[PDB]
Amino acid sequence: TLTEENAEMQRKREDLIKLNTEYRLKLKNLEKRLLEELNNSKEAMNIEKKLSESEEFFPQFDNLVEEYSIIGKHSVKIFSMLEKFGQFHWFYGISIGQFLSCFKRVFIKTRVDEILWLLYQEVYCQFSTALDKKFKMIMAMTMFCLYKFDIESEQYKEAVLTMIGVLSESSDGVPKLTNDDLRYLWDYVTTKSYISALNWFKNEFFVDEWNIADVVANSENNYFTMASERDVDGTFKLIELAKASKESLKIIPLGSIENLNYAQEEISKSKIEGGWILLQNIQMSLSWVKTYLHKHVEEHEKFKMFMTCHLTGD
């Protein structure tokens, strides 16, 4: 935030660095001049004045770091339950440098309210494409709670908690409502269409939901992991997407050693000259993948490569 969000913060940081360098250079020049004068027996004032002028920056820095603290607490909570989903299942891992990159993208894409809303929407659309639908709406309602319970009063919070409780069959009670929305919410929960209530909360807050094409388009990497349950398969959907993307997607199911060698040759060719390779059901030769693909991973453009795994698998 200090580096990029405000040009004043970075310009005073650079000014402090330049003032320190100028003071050191002036001290060295004064020492050399004193040695020369002893052997033979303006700039320092300007540097001192510049240092004294730049010393009037601590209250400004304190104000800037204080004004951006609630967003920091929100980010800590966001990372908290993002990492907590990594413990519920073995398929919801969340990185750290990826979070740094997505914050940089938020900077690239009431100033405080606007920037926190932008962070919420962009981090949600970049980090919620790695969950199944029920856990996606769990993320939706948790993030909606962290937004609303901090930007709204606590009577609205109590109303939301008692609506979640009657949704969870934990309690029954009339909420202390305070418009045209919660009346429709009570109409839905009296109609008992629960997924309609969840979709109504979503449409009440969420305005955009990234699809598969956008999430595979908004990336500069060449390695992608594709996951689906055993009752679903986006392989032919990926063929249709690649046809829309005018890319040659060459599906290779794993299997016998000849199939593994063919897949290795094809991905070598696709790294050499480009192309799209969809390794169907990479759980097939799990150890072969875990050795060969890991060794290959650990630079040609217009090359994307996908995995394929299953939820109830290895």
From Swiss-Prot:
Residues 1-58 form a coiled coil. It is found in: Cytoplasm, Cytoskeleton. It comes from the Eukaryota. Dynein heavy chains probably consist of an N-terminal stem (which binds cargo and interacts with other dynein components), and the head or motor domain. The motor contains six tandemly-linked AAA domains in the head, which form a ring. A stalk-like structure (formed by two of the coiled coil domains) protrudes between AAA 4 and AAA 5 and terminates in a microtubule-binding site. A seventh domain may also contribute to this ring; it is not clear whether the N-terminus or the C-terminus forms this extra domain. Present with 195 molecules/cell in log phase SD medium. Belongs to the dynein heavy chain family. The dynein complex consists of at least two heavy chains and a number of intermediate and light chains. Interacts with DYN3. Cytoplasmic dynein acts as a motor for the intracellular retrograde motility of vesicles and organelles along microtubules. Dynein has ATPase activity; the force-producing power stroke is thought to occur on release of ADP. Required to maintain uniform nuclear distribution in hyphae. May play an important role in the proper orientation of the mitotic spindle into the budding daughter cell yeast. Probably required for normal progression of the cell cycle. This is Dynein heavy chain, cytoplasmic. The lineage of its organism: Eukaryota, Fungi, Dikarya, Ascomycota, Saccharomycotina. The gene is DYN1.
